[PDB]
Write a protein that binds this DNA or RNA. Sequence first.
RNA 1: UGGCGAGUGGGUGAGUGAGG
DNA 2: CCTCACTCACCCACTCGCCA
Length: 149
Amino acid sequence: DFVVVYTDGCCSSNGRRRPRAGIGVYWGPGHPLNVGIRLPGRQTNQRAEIHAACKAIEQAKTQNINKLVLYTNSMFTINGITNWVQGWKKNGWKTSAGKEVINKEDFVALERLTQGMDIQWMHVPGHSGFIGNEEADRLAREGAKQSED
RNA sequence: UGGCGAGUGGGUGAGUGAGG
DNA sequence: CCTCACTCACCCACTCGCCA
Ligand SMILES: [Ca+2]
Ligand SMILES: [Ca+2]
Ligand SMILES: [Ca+2]
C-alpha cells in the first residue's frame, strides 16, 4: 500500500564562498526514478534537504502514488513540515527570536506538494542507516558536482 | 510599539573546510 | 579512527546594539 523512499540534501562548502548544493532520491535497486540533481536557487544544505523531499513527492505524483514513507536525516525538514508550519501560519511566519522564517519559500513549496499526499516522515541516523540512506547521500553528493541547467 | 542586526546556552539534527 | 576551523536553521527564552 505504501512506498519507501530515501532522500538527502547536501552542499559542498556550505556557508563558504562558493557553495554547491545537490539532492538525491532513492526508490529501489536500479530504480529509473533514482536521481541526483544540482539544486537551483540559494545554495544551502537546509534548502537541499527540503527540496530533496520535494522531488520525491514530485515523482510519486507522476506515478499515481499517494501513500509514501519518506526517509531523511534532516530533523529540520521533518519537524518543520510536521510541526512548525502550523504555528508559522498562525504567527505570520516568525521564528522564536521574532525574525522571519528563512526557508519559508521551501516549506511552502513542500506543504503545497503534500496536499492529497499521505506521507509518513521517518528520520534516518545519518551515519548509522542502511544502504538506502548511504546511497541517497551519494546521489546528492554527485548531483552537487554538476552545473545547473 | 514597529522595523533591523548581533549575542547568550541548552535541545534537534544536518552540511562542510584544513590536516594525520 | 584522530585533530583543529566553520555555517545551515529551527525549538526553548532573555540580553545587547541600530532606526522611527
Ligand atoms: Ca528551486
Ligand atoms: Ca524591538
Ligand atoms: Ca552535529
